[PDB]
DNA sequence: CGGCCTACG
DNA sequence: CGTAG
DNA sequence: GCCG
């Protein structure tokens, strides 16, 4: 009834089990903060199963046979159905460890390992970190200075204005190059944490060397508040206009050759869980190795040419899912 | 039990 | 180590 | 934590 991998079923952005999925995702996040990637995956997969259901779970019976629901995830759901809250989830939510790890890992330039080290050192607040800038990389300093703006969501209206400025710089860098909106906005989100763009050119090879030329032009326009600088991915903080002022926004820029564009579009459109599940499916069920550059057959030692995302789904034996149904 | 996505900066 | 989805 |  429900297939085991998230890439085998449609997952819409909005659904019928929001509260249940959110609670399981708290436990997934907390498992990640402890370095338990396997538990994180299970709770994420269980949450995503609920997103894919056609109606609300109202009774524990309805979990029977669903993939990724065993004793622990079922107990979480049971407690939410019976009491409206799950004690384990609420204990996580209130915990100093969870709240601090969440706050620190939200900083651009800080991952779980850094956050955990700071936690063990006794640090708890952003102002704790600011008082010890000797412990911070340039990237982390930028992430801390811009943290407040970066915590506020970007609107789709903002996205279109940003895309036109990126297109202007891209067109000067390489006439004929194109800019495609990817990430969560391509999946239909009305808001987001950042904006992701994929850049290519219809003539194979012309995109070589492009990203430095684009970044130099955006920096000369005064739009770049932070970037790391041959390269093909740039993780930036941009200046976005606002009434009478502006705000900082995270923008990711990625270049791919047109031969790789379908794979890069698929990868950068996400969701994160969808892509991990798709790569897992490819390797474990089909014996093929997937990344954002291509799809490799390791027995014939050949790469699959794709001209579209549709081609990639076909080559994996999966029903096509439009981006709006990849919200695993 | 092993496995859990797979890259680039 | 960070980043990405 | 769950699947195979
Ligand atoms: Cl684990
Ligand atoms: Mg994004
Ligand atoms: Mg991004
Ligand atoms: Na971070």
Whether residues A190 and A140 fall in one domain: no
Task: Confirm or deny that A252 is annotated as ligand binding.
Answer: yes
DSSP lists the bridge partners of residue A242 as A245
Question: Obtained via which technique?
Answer: X-ray
Of A78, A95, A112, which one is at a domain's C-terminal end? A95
Asked whether strand B has any atom less than 7 Å from the CB of A208, the reply is no
Instruction: Please tell me which residue lies nearest to nucleotide B3, judged from CA to C1'.
Output: A38
d(CA A194, CA A37): 24
Q: Which one of the listed residues A128, A149, A252, A311 is annotated catalytic?
A: A252
Report resolution (Å) to 1 decimal: 1.5
Whether residues A141 and A189 fall in one domain: no
For the question of residue A252 being annotated catalytic, the response is yes
d(CA A45, CA A4): 9
d(CA A126, CA A154): 22
Whether residues A217 and A232 fall in one domain: yes
Which residues does a chain break follow in chain A (C to N more than 2.5 Å)? 229
> Considering its fold, how many domains does chain A have in total?
4
Of A70, A95, A120, which one is at a domain's C-terminal end? A95
d(CA A56, CA A114): 39
Whether residues A191 and A247 fall in one domain: yes
For the question of residue A158 being annotated catalytic, the response is no
Task: Confirm or deny that A220 is annotated as ligand binding.
Answer: no
d(CA A230, CA A208): 9
Of A215, A231, A258, which one is at a domain's C-terminal end? A258
Whether residues A129 and A168 fall in one domain: no
DSSP lists the bridge partners of residue A246 as A241
Which residues 11-70 of chain A have a CB under 7 Å from nucleic chain D? 38-39, 41-43, 46, 67-70
Whether residues A125 and A201 fall in one domain: no
Nucleotides of B under 7 A from a protein CB: 3-9
Cα distances from A50 to residues A38, A43, A96, A236, in angstroms, run: 19, 11, 29, 34
If you measure from the C-alpha of residue A18 to the centroid of ligand 2, how many angstroms do you get, rounded to a whole number? Answer: 21
Q: By C-alpha distance, which of A326, A327, A259, A325 is closest to A293?
A: A259
If you measure from the C-alpha of residue A74 to the centroid of ligand 2, how many angstroms do you get, rounded to a whole number? Answer: 31
| CB distance A142 to A237 below 8 Å | yes
Whether residues A26 and A56 fall in one domain: yes
| CB distance A292 to A268 below 8 Å | yes
Q: By C-alpha distance, which of A62, A48, A66 is closest to A10?
A: A48
Whether residues A5 and A73 fall in one domain: yes
Using C1' positions and the CA of A42, the closest nucleotide is D1
Whether residues A84 and A22 fall in one domain: yes
The b-or-e profile of A205-233 (16+ CB within 10 A means b, else e) is: ebbeebbeebbebbeeeebbbbbeeeebe
Residues with CB under 5 A from ligand 4 (ion): A 105, 110
d(CA A144, CA A139): 9
Q: Which residue has the tokens 């029903």?
A: A319
- Give the residue numbers spanning the domain of A176: 152-258
The b-or-e profile of A274-289 (16+ CB within 10 A means b, else e) is: bbbbbbebbeeeeebe
Asked whether strand B has any atom less than 7 Å from the CB of A283, the reply is yes
Whether residues A40 and A74 fall in one domain: yes
Q: By C-alpha distance, which of A227, A235, A221 is closest to A167?
A: A221
- CA atom of A86 to C1′ atom of D2, Å: 20
Asked whether strand B has any atom less than 7 Å from the CB of A228, the reply is yes
- Would you state the torsion angle of the CA atoms of residues A39, A42, A46, A51, taken in this order, to the nearest 10 degrees? 100
DSSP lists the bridge partners of residue A253 as A197, A234
d(CA A199, CA A182): 10
If you measure from the C-alpha of residue A278 to the centroid of ligand 4, how many angstroms do you get, rounded to a whole number? Answer: 24
Listed in sequence order, the residues at least 6 apart from A235 whose beta carbon sits closer than 8 Å to its beta carbon are A108, A227, A228, A250, A252
| CB distance A196 to A252 below 8 Å | yes
Whether residues A145 and A232 fall in one domain: no
Q: By C-alpha distance, which of A268, A271, A269, A235 is closest to A251?
A: A235
Listed in sequence order, the residues at least 6 apart from A24 whose beta carbon sits closer than 8 Å to its beta carbon are A43, A44, A46, A47, A50, A73, A76, A77
Encoding tokens for residue A181?
């909106």
Using C1' positions and the CA of A282, the closest nucleotide is B5
- CA atom of A82 to C1′ atom of B6, Å: 41
If you measure from the C-alpha of residue A96 to the centroid of ligand 3, how many angstroms do you get, rounded to a whole number? Answer: 28
Q: Which residue has the tokens 């004793």?
A: A71
Whether residues A238 and A287 fall in one domain: no
Q: What is the SS3 string spanning chain A?
A: CCCCCHHHCCECCCCCCHHHHHHHHHHHHHHHHCCCHHHHHHHHHHHHHHHCCCCCCCCHHHHCCCCCCCHHHHHHHHHHHHHCCCHHHHHHHHCHHHHHHHHHHCCCCCCHHHHHHHHHCCCCCHHHHHCCHHHCCHHHHHHHHCHHHHCCCEEHHHHHHHHHHHHHHHHHHCCCCEEEECHHHHCCCCEECEEEEEEECCCCCCCCCHHHHHHHHHHHCCCEEECCCCCCEEEEEEEEEECCEEEEEEEEEEECCCCCHHHHHHHHHCCHHHHHHHHHHHHHHHCCEECCCCEEECCCCEECCCCCHHHHHHHCCCCCCCHHHECC
Q: By C-alpha distance, which of A65, A42, A53 is closest to A17?
A: A53
If you measure from the C-alpha of residue A60 to the centroid of ligand 3, how many angstroms do you get, rounded to a whole number? Answer: 37
């Amino acid at each position: 009834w429900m297939p085991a991998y998230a890439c085998q079923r449609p997952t819409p952005l909005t659904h019928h089990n929001t509260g249940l999925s959110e609670a399981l995702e708290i436990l997934a996040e907390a498992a990640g903060f402890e370095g338990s990637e396997g538990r994180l995956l299970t709770f994420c997969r269980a949450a995503s199963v609920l997103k894919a259901l056609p109606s609300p779970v109202t009774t524990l019976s309805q979990l029977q046979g669903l993939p990724h629901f065993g004793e622990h995830s079922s107990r979480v759901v049971q407690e939410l159905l019976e009491h409206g809250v799950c004690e384990e989830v609420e204990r996580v939510r209130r915990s100093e460890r969870y709240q601090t790890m969440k706050l620190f890992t939200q900083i651009f330039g800080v991952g779980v390992k850094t956050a955990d080290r700071w936690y063990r050192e006794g640090l708890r607040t952003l102002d704790d970190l600011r008082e010890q800038p000797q412990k911070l990389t340039q990237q982390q300093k930028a992430g801390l200075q811009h943290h407040q703006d970066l915590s506020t969501p970007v609107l789709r209206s903002d996205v279109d204005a940003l895309q036109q400025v990126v297109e202007e710089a891209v067109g000067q860098a390489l006439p004929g190059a194109t800019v495609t909106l990817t990430g969560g906005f391509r999946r239909g989100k009305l808001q987001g944490h950042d904006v992701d763009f994929l850049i290519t050119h219809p003539k194979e090879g012309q995109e070589a060397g492009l990203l430095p030329r684009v970044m130099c032009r955006l920096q000369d326009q005064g739009l770049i508040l932070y970037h790391q600088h041959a390269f093909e991915r740039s993780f930036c903080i941009f200046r976005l206009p606002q009434p009478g002022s502006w705000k900082a926004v995270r923008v990711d820029l990625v270049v791919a050759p047109v031969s790789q564009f379908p794979f890069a579009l698929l990868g950068w459109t996400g969701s994160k869980l969808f892509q991990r599940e798709l790569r897992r499916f490819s390797r474990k069920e089909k014996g093929l190795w997937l990344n954002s550059h291509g799809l490799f057959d390791p027995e014939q030692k050949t790469f699959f040419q794709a001209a579209s995302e549709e081609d990639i789904f076909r080559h994996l034996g999966l029903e096509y899912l439009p981006p709006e149904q990849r919200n695993a």
